[PDB]
Amino acid sequence: IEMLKRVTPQVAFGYPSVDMVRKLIYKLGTANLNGQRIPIADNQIIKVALGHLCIESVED
């Protein structure tokens, strides 16, 4: 928050609801894997990255 106080003129920000956090990740969501900027496509992308952390598919 104190970092955001310095940069307040450069950014717009707020507190998104669950329907908005959903709709970003389904439409526009992408995974930065090994510095490649890969599109999210299928849930086997994010099982391989994040399955050890108990996050299996895009809902999780």
């Binding site: 669950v18 849930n43 099982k47 299996e56 598919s57 809902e59 999780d60």
Partner: protein, 52 residues
């Protein structure tokens, strides 16, 4: 080359062993994601009913 042409026959089978196995693993996961999506739906609506 005769040994390599023999050995690729094992790599055909060992490929198709994992093809059967990982598809079977996928169907087990396709059961378990469905309960989580139903959980988080009914967990979200109960969060709203709690505060309201």
């Amino acid at each position: 080359l005769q040994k390599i042409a023999a050995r690729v026959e094992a790599q055909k089978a060992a490929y198709l062993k994992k093809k059967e196995e990982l598809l079977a693993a996928a169907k087990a996961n396709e059961a378990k994601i469905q309960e989580r999506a139903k959980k988080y739906a009914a967990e979200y609506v109960s969060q709203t009913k709690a505060e309201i």
